[PDB]
Ligand binder design. Structure first.
Ligand SMILES: CCCCCCCCCCCCCCCCCC(=O)OC[C@H](COP(=O)([O-])OCC(O)COP(=O)([O-])OC[C@@H](COC(=O)CCCCCCCCCCCCCCCCC)OC(=O)CCCCCCCCCCCCCCCCC)OC(=O)CCCCCCCCCCCCCCCCC
Ligand SMILES: CCCCCCCCCCCCCCCCCC(=O)OC[C@H](COP(=O)([O-])OCC(O)COP(=O)([O-])OC[C@@H](COC(=O)CCCCCCCCCCCCCCCCC)OC(=O)CCCCCCCCCCCCCCCCC)OC(=O)CCCCCCCCCCCCCCCCC
Ligand SMILES: CCCCCCCCCCCCCCCCCC(=O)OC[C@H](COP(=O)([O-])OCC(O)COP(=O)([O-])OC[C@@H](COC(=O)CCCCCCCCCCCCCCCCC)OC(=O)CCCCCCCCCCCCCCCCC)OC(=O)CCCCCCCCCCCCCCCCC
Ligand SMILES: CCCCCCCCCCCCCCCCCC(=O)OC[C@H](COP(=O)([O-])OCC[N+](C)(C)C)OC(=O)CCCCCCCCCCCCCCCCC
Ligand SMILES: CCCCCCCCCCCCCCCCCC(=O)OC[C@H](COP(=O)([O-])OCC[N+](C)(C)C)OC(=O)CCCCCCCCCCCCCCCCC
Ligand SMILES: CCCCCCCCCCCCCCCCCC(=O)OC[C@H](COP(=O)([O-])OCC[N+](C)(C)C)OC(=O)CCCCCCCCCCCCCCCCC
Ligand SMILES: CCCCCCCCCCCCCCCCCC(=O)OC[C@H](COP(=O)([O-])OCC[N+](C)(C)C)OC(=O)CCCCCCCCCCCCCCCCC
Ligand SMILES: CCCCCCCCCCCCCCCC(=O)OC[C@H](COP(=O)(O)O)OC(=O)CCCCCCCCCCCCCCC
Ligand code: SF4
Lengths: 58, 73, 283, 62, 161, 133, 64, 59, 93, 142, 102, 67, 59, 121
């Protein structure tokens, strides 16, 4: 029973991993756009900080 | 006129189970209608969304198709 | 209104804290009622085992026995021994009651149906159990009864054993779930309950359950024959009611823990139709 | 604890059946692992059906 | 007036303390066995909500069940004084009541009422299990009624003063 | 940057990934690095802007897609962002977006059960061996 | 299994601190009002680690 | 072993199996739990309702 | 025709009302917890740690944008309170 | 079912019971197989983990082997005087054999519809992956 | 040991005034190892922006689900030598404890 | 005995395909592990690192994209 | 809802605990401690090792 | 582990205990406590306790606590490998088995020396 139950749990884990492959694929499809938005916001904040630093230190 | 003991015991079991089962299935008692209304409000509209210019079907045509098919009931 | 609104920013939030307090009070009252019903169930089950009616006249057919005993425990007067430390004698049961009524936070009633989003449920359970054992030991020490002090030492020994026993059980369990959260066990137990893997150590699981619940054969701290009453030999009224409530709270919540981690939790026993079931459905 | 002939025969048959049961269980576990391998192969084929494009790393990475 | 609230709360308190009536696990002589017989299934005590507690601190009733000796009288007095209030005392058996078979002895106290205030007496030697059950139930009824035995007088408005 | 919420952005991206593929490839190539540590966004700003403009263009949908988009939104709300559990509804939305003309016949060939309100409650219906990942 | 005699017994030597009661033993009044005791036994028990060492029973609580 | 503290000259694997069954799989919590809790609870209660019924007496 | 219950079942049924009361109280407690955690979110939100890294990022992106990005990008020297009762850093140091 | 369909999380979120849709999807795939039955080139490239003959033999043999094992077990350890427990254990062994055989058959079906996924048209692939048969209207006569 | 709680009758004032107060004063005056760490509220929180940055590519490439990853990478991959040393140390310590008991 | 059995089975699993060989003998660890383990490892010599897919060039199926 | 079945199981286990308390005797602290630290710790560790070996075999 | 909700719940639990405090105080109205000689003295089964506050016990099982201190840490060291056993490799597997074997050998040595049982002193 111990051996068979461990085998069954490994089967469940591997099925979960099989579905995780497709979930990762969907996440990859969605990744570039969110990354672009995050980068644009990050660069906007960096530009504001650069302007402030230049004005204060010049 | 008499009834079987198991029939009476099943009656008692049903008396316990039907109310408990219903209460468990509907934890938000009497607010299920409010939940439905909130879901309807969350559902977006054509004005809320932005549509393509070269739409195959216009908004009126889509509404008529949905009415004909009885999409939501 | 423009110049008056700032004055009420912090004043309009107090009702929210009051609502939070009210909800917590309701939850605590409901769990107290559950534990009272558990005590009545215990008396009735022991009555069945011993072939006796049990509580039958406190309320029609003994429906309000737990209410009666709780009210009586409230009513009973209390006196602190002169030789005992007045501050600690009352401080210890207060802390024990606070810890016992904090127990219920570490409970799950669904995939994510928990009052708080706690991840280390097992860590919380271990810490709370250690705190309650601390309270029991301090109770025995500050009540200078020799029997109470021996009960506290027995509680210490029980805690020492529980450490390793429950730690090893948790180590074996986390090896599958890979988390301390109760939810992660049920997803694996959907097909087969985790008790099947541990069927060989089912006796040890039963031992762990009884030892953590402080039930026989592990009722050493409260042994009523070896010791007069145990750690509560000099406590009466609601001071002793608090210890009883804490013991029953621990019993109920560790029963829940065992059910979730080894018996599928909220999953029906689908293993009874395993042979007839199909593992996939492809159209 | 002397044993009679019938009890000894029962004990011997119990031991033999236990050995056979253990061997059969191990064989079935081996078969179950092989089945898991087959399922993994099938699902890999299904997933890779449409994921056939490999993009080389840009030359500027180095 | 407070009576409006006190009287219903008095009734609730009496009901609760009647329903939960825990005696002390203390037996001295053959009367102990009769107490055990009442506790056991044939005449279940639990039906009437009486459960025995080992420590006096958690006891409501003092069952003086058995003979009391001069060598033990101080112990009985100490136990009675250490039992948390409110409490009642039930003497069981001839020996506990008035010295019983050993009233003419040099060691036995001629009655537990000399050392303790006895609320109720249950005659017998030994009292039957049903006799002890009757005594306990009568004590419970008297206990329930003790809260308000019509002491305070009613004024023209029927409110006690 | 979009004035759009996260889950709706994911739903839209599941379709936009096929319309702005060249922009996505350009952005990916620009951000490629020899180590897992991310590259400075200042170098990829231009590709990111191009990708976002194409995403703005793609976010538009035909009105016939509104029901599919709403049910996908409801699914992604009841499930806390689990794309796999709601891929069927997202897949329907992608199908409606691609060649919306055929979605009329798609809806016409609908059963009585499918022509019903879609309510999601994952606590009541966990599913089969859901790892939530 | 190895020997444990030295761990199992502790004798007392004349005027020796190590071979002596280095602890204040627990002198408990087992009974008379004790659930285990039948009710009229006043046993003075000398416990040392919850192990009985010395018994002084008083049984006159039921002399009649 | 029945007659005294001594042990048999030649121990057999039957003792090994018995000890393994007793220790690895503690049968108390199952054997006794079933036999008492589940079975003895099926007997009618022996209680006599004193207020409304009286126990047997003799002249 | 005495169609009475079997003796074992009749004996067992004595303790049933206690089970019914326990179920009433337990359902009350569970429903109260469910409603308390359901009303604020309008759903039973999955635990944050029961989610993938990408899912966590997508879930918390909107909260980060509404709470930190907008104040950061609309910051002015005179917006900060002089009492130093400002919002704490997202990663407190 | 233990795992449900491998393509999607079955009964996740909303539970859908559409026997009409299931029948339409089954009919569509049956028509597809029938239409491409004659194509020898297509039949050549069909692959499966376990042969159809092997899975059929296992399906029809596992319950028999289980019943034989149960018969041996009852003969060796069960008292012939009684019959209730002997029948119960024999049926349990037969059900275990049937479980093994049914698992063989179901895994063959899983392999058939997974390894050959690339051979289906786009509409049939979508219909298989999703629970809806609306992707393959043409195949089920509409 | 020390069940009653009675402790040595000790007066800390003498040593406090003779050695400890002045030595502590000197140590506090001349002791600061923190080089340039800055308190919160040193600058407005609106100037800090990195915490908002998110790496979605790394997020979808990351499969970890527990916070024990650094601990395992340390005890079982990198610092496994010290892990084994700790194990041997605990074994030898158990032996030493047994010998001290004897 | 269990250790010996599993080790023997692991060494016998070489018959199976590469992905199904024993993980005792073959390593399958996250990208964070593998990068640091094989960064400048000439013994393995995996090659350049795919940033957006978190794998080396020579690892099987490193960059797997749709369509 | 899941808590319905969970409450059923909790009640079952509470009844099991109550029945066990009514059936079984009480251990000694020294006896149980010796049993634990001499037998049950080894049993737990051996079971853990067996689980590790089986997981390695299946993975 | 939680958030500030846990501290607020601790405060709420204290407020809840105030309710039981109020009930206990109100119960004072339904009984009177007389002053008696032995009413507020230590209970020793119906007789005066000879000793109070000199209640020293014998800690002759201290080796069990000594070994618990070590074995708690030994078990704690195993958590990361158990959590991430899906990432196990040859080195990690060898180290885990090595550590478990060390624990077993320490337990075996303790059993051999017979320090897991009560002693005379
Ligand atoms: C302004 C709003 C207005 C709204 C509309 C108006 C109001 C509508 C309210 C409707 C509900 C009110 C309550 C109805 C109770 C009916 C009781 C009855 O039938 O009388 C007989 C019954 C006789 O009991 P008894 O005299 O003690 O038994 C005699 C002997 O013991 C001999 O025993 P026996 O042979 O008689 O067998 C006993 C048992 C035999 O039956 C069974 O055995 C089956 C039940 C036990 C299952 C056990 C499962 C676990 C198994 C464990 C293992 C096996 C067991 C053995 C183990 C040990 C083995 C050794 O049979 C029963 O008693 C069944 C009665 C079930 C009543 C509970 C129904 C609700 C429960 C779920 C919660 C509902 C929440 C509200 C939902 C609202 C929406 C619908 O009357 C009672 O005394 C009640 C006993 C049960 C406790 C009920 C406590 C209720 C407390 C108040 C709740 C208020 C909140 C909910 C309502 C809120 C408003 C909606
Ligand atoms: C006499 C002279 C006159 C005196 C007058 C005194 C003053 C009167 C009031 C004056 C002021 C009025 C102002 C009105 C306007 C402003 C209103 C406002 O601000 O709210 C807006 C505010 C937000 O506006 P919204 O978003 O539009 O609201 C829509 C919903 O929130 C949307 O909901 P959702 O869809 O999100 O679903 C979630 C919702 C849905 O959940 C529900 O509320 C539905 C019901 C849940 C289950 C309840 C089960 C109760 C029974 C369990 C079993 C108990 C057994 C033990 C006790 C014995 C029972 C016989 O639940 C929640 O949101 C969490 C609330 C949890 C409430 C706590 C549990 C309630 C029971 C407490 C029991 C206490 C212990 C027992 C005491 C026993 C005493 C003998 O609304 C709320 O937050 C609603 C809170 C409702 C709380 C529950 C109220 C009672 C419900 C009926 C059950 C009553 C049971 C009584 C038992 C008695 C036994 C003797
Ligand atoms: C996926 C994982 C699954 C789990 C894995 C677990 C693995 C564990 C492995 C390690 C352990 C292995 C153990 C092996 C054991 C066998 C070893 C062996 O072969 O040794 C030979 C050994 C030597 O025996 P022998 O010397 O040959 O003598 C034969 C015996 O004298 C016997 O003489 P006999 O044969 O003439 O009489 C015995 C017979 C007597 O049988 C009968 O009388 C017929 C049944 C009477 C039922 C009575 C209750 C009816 C209730 C109706 C209620 C209606 C209510 C209506 C109103 C409702 C209102 C709501 O009893 C039975 O055989 C009962 C079997 C039928 C049970 C009921 C059907 C269950 C179906 C389960 C689903 C299956 C679906 C397929 C897929 C399954 C997938 C797992 O055999 C035995 O010792 C036999 C022992 C039989 C004991 C039967 C106990 C039955 C259960 C009693 C429950 C009582 C409950 C009371 C109430 C409690 C309330 C709290
Ligand atoms: C946390 C609580 C505990 C959980 C434990 C895990 C579940 C284990 C379930 C039982 C599996 C079998 C274990 C071994 C049993 C060995 C019994 C035995 O000794 O038989 C011979 C015994 C006696 O034979 P013996 O030879 O061993 O001893 C007798 C000695 N002579 C011969 C001299 C007389 O015979 C029996 O009566 C056995 C009856 C066993 C019935 C067990 C019922 C258990 C019911 C409660 C289990 C928990 C249910 C939880 C449900 C939860 C649902 C959500
Ligand atoms: C809460 C406690 C519950 C305890 C219940 C105790 C009740 C009393 C005992 C009833 C036993 C009834 C007989 C069958 C029990 C289930 C056996 C099992 O695990 O098979 C599932 C397994 C199912 O495994 P599977 O999941 O691989 O099934 C096929 C899987 N697919 C679909 C993917 C192909 O059954 C079999 O496959 C047949 C046996 C295969 C060989 C290996 C079996 C190892 C375990 C055997 C234990 C046998 C114990 C009983 C011995 C005989 C007693 C008469
Ligand atoms: C009227 C006089 C008042 C006198 C002063 C009052 C003194 C109160 C002393 C106790 C409370 C201290 C509160 C301040 C510290 C808060 C720490 C913190 O940040 O945690 C939240 C943090 C929340 O952090 P986070 O992870 O949510 O991140 C927050 C993110 N930002 C910054 C954006 C908001 O908690 C945690 O992260 C983990 C949960 C910890 C739960 C701890 C539970 C046990 C607590 C026991 C306290 C017992 C106190 C009483 C007894 C002991 C004697 C004091
Ligand atoms: C969210 C749900 C909330 C539910 C809360 C439910 C809890 C209800 C608690 C009720 C407590 C009642 C206490 C009664 C005290 C008076 C009686 C008494 O003790 O008698 C002994 C003594 C009097 O003893 P006596 O000498 O008169 O003797 C009485 C005996 N006979 C009759 C024989 C003479 O009490 C007094 O001293 C009385 C006078 C002073 C007290 C006056 C009342 C003060 C009320 C304070 C209320 C505080 C509310 C706080 C709210 C906020 C809490 C966070
Ligand atoms: C973890 C809880 C669940 C249990 C899981 C582990 C089960 C281990 C036993 C599996 C079956 C072994 C079958 C052996 C058949 C055989 O050779 O059998 C040969 C003989 C047969 O004797 P009989 O003639 O009496 O049948 O038996 C033996 O030699 C007994 C071997 C010991 C078995 C004791 C129980 C296992 C204890 C743990 C293993 C360590 C054993 C050390 C012995 C010195
Ligand atoms: S009254 Fe009679 S029965 Fe009771 S103790 Fe005295 S002699 Fe014994």
């Amino acid at each position: 029973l111990q051996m068979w139950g461990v085998g069954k749990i490994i089967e469940i884990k591997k099925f979960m991993k099989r579905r995780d492959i497709e979930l990762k694929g969907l996440q990859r499809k969605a990744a570039p756009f969110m990354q672009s938005m995050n980068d644009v916001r990050h660069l906007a904040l960096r530009e504001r900080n650069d302007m402030l630093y230049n004005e204060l230190l010049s | 006129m008499n009834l079987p003991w198991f029939v009476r015991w099943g009656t008692d079991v049903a008396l316990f189970f039907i109310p408990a089962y219903t209460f468990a299935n509907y934890p938000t008692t009497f607010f299920v209608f409010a939940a439905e209304k909130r879901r309807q409000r969350r559902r977006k509209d054509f004005s809320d969304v932005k549509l393509r210019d070269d739409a195959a079907f216009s908004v009126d045509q889509v509404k008529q198709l949905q009415t004909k098919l009885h999409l939501k009931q | 209104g423009f110049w008056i609104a700032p004055l009420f920013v912090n004043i309009l939030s107090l009702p929210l804290y009051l609502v939070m307090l009210v909800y917590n009070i309701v939850c605590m009252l409901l769990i107290t009622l559950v534990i009272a019903s558990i005590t009545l169930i215990e008396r009735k089950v022991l009555s069945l085992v011993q072939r006796r009616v049990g509580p039958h006249y406190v309320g029609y057919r003994g429906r309000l026995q737990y209410i009666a005993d709780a009210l009586k425990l409230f009513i009973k007067g209390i006196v602190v021994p002169e030789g005992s430390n007045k501050f600690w004698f009352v401080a210890i049961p207060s802390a024990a009651g606070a810890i016992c009524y904090t127990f219920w936070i570490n409970s799950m009633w669904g995939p994510s149906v928990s009052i708080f989003d706690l991840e280390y449920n097992l860590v919380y359970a271990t810490i709370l159990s250690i705190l309650f054992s601390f309270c029991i030991m301090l109770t025995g020490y500050f009540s200078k009864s020799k029997y109470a002090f021996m009960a506290s030492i027995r509680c210490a020994i029980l805690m020492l054993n529980i450490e390793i026993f429950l730690g090893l059980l948790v180590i074996n369990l986390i090896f599958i779930s890979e988390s301390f959260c109760f939810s992660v066990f049920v997803i694996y137990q959907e097909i087969i309950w985790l008790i099947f893997i541990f069927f060989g150590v089912s006796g040890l699981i039963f031992i762990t359950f009884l030892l953590e619940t402080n039930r026989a054969p592990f009722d050493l701290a409260e042994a009523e024959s070896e010791l007069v009453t145990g750690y509560s030999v000099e406590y009466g009224g609601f001071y002793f009611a608090l210890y009883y409530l804490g013991e029953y709270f621990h019993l109920f919540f560790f029963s829940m823990v065992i059910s979730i981690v080894l018996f599928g939790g909220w999953e029906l026993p689908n293993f009874l139709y395993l042979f007839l079931l199909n593992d996939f459905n492809i159209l | 604890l002397k044993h009679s002939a019938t009890v000894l025969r029962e004990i011997k048959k119990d031991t033999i059946m236990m050995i056979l049961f253990i061997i059969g269980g191990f064989t079935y576990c081996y078969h179950m692992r092989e089945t898991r391998f087959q399922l993994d192969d099938d699902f890999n084929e299904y997933v890779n059906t449409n994921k056939q494009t490999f993009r080389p790393i840009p030359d500027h990475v180095k | 007036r407070v009576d409006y609230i006190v009287t219903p709360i008095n009734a609730v308190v009496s009901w609760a303390r009647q329903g939960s009536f825990w005696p002390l696990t203390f037996g001295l002589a053959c009367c102990a066995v009769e107490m055990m017989h009442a506790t056991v299934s044939r005449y279940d005590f639990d039906r009437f909500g009486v459960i025995f507690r080992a420590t006096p601190r958690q006891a409501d009733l003092i069952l003086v069940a058995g003979t009391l000796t001069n060598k033990m009288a101080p112990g009985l007095r100490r136990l009675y004084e250490q039992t948390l209030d409110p409490k009642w005392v039930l003497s069981m058996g001839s020996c506990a009541n008035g010295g019983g078979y050993y009233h003419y002895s040099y060691s036995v106290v001629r009655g537990c009422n000399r050392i303790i205030p006895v609320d109720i007496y249950v005659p017998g030697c030994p009292p039957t299990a049903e006799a002890l059950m009757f005594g306990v139930l009568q004590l419970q009824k008297s206990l329930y009624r003790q809260i308000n035995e019509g002491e305070k007088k009613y004024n023209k408005k029927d409110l006690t003063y | 940057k979009m004035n759009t919420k996260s889950f709706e952005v994911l739903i839209h991206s599941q379709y936009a990934f096929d319309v702005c593929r060249e922009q996505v490839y350009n952005f990916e190539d620009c951000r490629q690095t020899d180590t897992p540590l991310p590259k400075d966004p200042i170098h990829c700003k231009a590709q990111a802007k191009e990708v976002l403009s194409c995403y703005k263009e793609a976010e538009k949908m035909d009105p016939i897609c509104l029901s599919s988009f709403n049910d996908s939104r409801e699914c992604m709300f009841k499930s806390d962002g689990n794309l796999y559990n709601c891929k069927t509804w997202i897949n329907q939305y992608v199908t409606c977006q691609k060649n919306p003309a055929a979605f009329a016949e798609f809806l016409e060939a609908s059963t009585a059960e499918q022509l019903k309100s879609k309510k999601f409650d994952f606590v009541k219906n966990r599913g089969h061996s859901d790892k939530y990942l | 299994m190895n020997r444990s005699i030295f761990q199992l017994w502790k004798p007392e030597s004349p005027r020796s601190n190590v071979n002596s009661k280095q602890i204040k033993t627990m002198n408990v009044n087992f009974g008379p009002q004790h659930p285990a005791a039948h009710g009229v036994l006043r046993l003075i028990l000398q416990l040392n680690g919850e192990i009985a060492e010395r018994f002084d029973p008083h049984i006159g609580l039921l002399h009649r | 072993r029945l007659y005294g503290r001594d042990k048999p000259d030649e121990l057999d694997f039957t003792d090994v199996w018995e000890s393994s069954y007793q220790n690895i799989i503690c049968p108390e919590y199952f054997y006794h739990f079933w036999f008492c809790g589940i079975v003895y609870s099926f007997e009618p209660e022996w209680t006599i309702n004193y207020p409304f019924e009286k126990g047997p007496l003799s002249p | 025709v005495n169609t009475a219950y079997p003796t074992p079942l009749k004996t067992i049924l004595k303790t049933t009302p206690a089970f019914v009361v326990y179920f009433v109280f337990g359902l009350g407690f569970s429903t109260v917890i469910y409603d308390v955690v359901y009303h604020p979110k309008d759903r039973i939100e999955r635990f944050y740690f029961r989610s993938s890294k990408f899912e966590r990022l997508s879930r918390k992106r909107d909260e980060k944008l509404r709470h930190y990005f907008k104040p950061a990008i609309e910051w002015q020297p005179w917006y900060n309170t002089s009492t130093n009762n400002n919002t704490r850093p997202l990663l407190r140091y | 079912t233990n795992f449900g369909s491998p393509f999607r999380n079955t009964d996740s979120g909303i539970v859908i019971r559409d026997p009409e849709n299931e029948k339409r999807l089954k009919l569509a795939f049956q028509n597809f197989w029938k239409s491409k039955q004659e194509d020898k080139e297509f039949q050549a490239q069909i692959k499966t983990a376990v042969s159809k003959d092997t899975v059929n033999f296992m399906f029809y043999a596992s319950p028999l082997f289980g019943a034989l094992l149960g018969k041996t077990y009852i003969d060796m350890f069960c008292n012939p005087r009684y019959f209730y427990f002997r029948a119960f254990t024999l049926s349990m062994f037969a059900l275990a054999g049937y479980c093994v055989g049914n698992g063989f058959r179901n895994r063959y079906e899983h392999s058939l519809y997974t390894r050959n996924y690339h051979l289906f048209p786009k509409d049939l692939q979508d219909a298989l992956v999703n629970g809806d048969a609306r992707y393959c209207i043409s195949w089920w006569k509409q | 040991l020390n069940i009653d709680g009675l402790h040595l009758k000790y007066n800390h004032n003498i040593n406090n005034v003779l050695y400890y107060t002045p030595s502590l004063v000197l140590f506090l005056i001349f002791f600061n190892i923190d080089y340039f760490s800055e308190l919160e509220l040193f600058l407005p929180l609106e100037l800090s922006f990195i915490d908002i940055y998110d790496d979605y590519y790394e997020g979808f490439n990351n499969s970890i689900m527990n916070d024990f990853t650094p601990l395992t990478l340390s005890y079982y991959s990198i610092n496994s030598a010290e892990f084994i040393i700790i194990g041997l140390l605990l074994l030898l310590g158990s032996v030493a404890c047994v010998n001290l008991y004897k | 005995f269990c250790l010996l059995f599993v080790l023997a089975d692991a060494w016998g699993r070489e018959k199976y395909a590469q992905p199904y060989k024993s993980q005792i003998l073959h390593g399958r660890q996250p990208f964070g592990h593998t990068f640091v383990q094989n960064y400048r490892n000439q013994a393995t010599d995996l090659g350049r690192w795919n940033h957006n897919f978190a794998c080396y060039e020579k690892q099987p199926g490193c960059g797997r994209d749709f369509d | 809802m899941p808590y319905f079945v969970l409450l059923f199981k909790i009640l079952i286990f509470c009844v099991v605990a109550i029945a066990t308390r009514g059936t079984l005797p009480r251990y000694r602290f020294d006896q149980f401690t010796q049993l634990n630290w001499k037998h049950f710790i080894y049993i737990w560790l051996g079971f853990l090792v067996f689980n590790l070996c089986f997981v390695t075999f299946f993975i | 582990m939680g958030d500030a909700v846990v501290i607020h719940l601790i405060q709420n639990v204290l407020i809840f205990g105030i309710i039981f405090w109020l009930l206990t105080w109100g119960a004072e109205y339904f009984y009177t406590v007389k002053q008696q000689l032995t009413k507020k003295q230590f209970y020793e089964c119906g007789f005066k306790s000879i000793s109070e506050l000199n209640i020293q016990i014998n800690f002759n099982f201290f080796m069990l606590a000594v070994f618990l201190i070590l074995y708690d840490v030994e078990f704690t060291f195993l958590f990361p490998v158990l959590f991430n056993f899906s990432m196990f490799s040859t080195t990690e597997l060898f180290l885990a088995f090595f550590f478990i074997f060390l624990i077993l050998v320490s337990l075996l040595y303790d059993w051999l020396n017979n320090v897991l049982s009560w002693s005379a002193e």
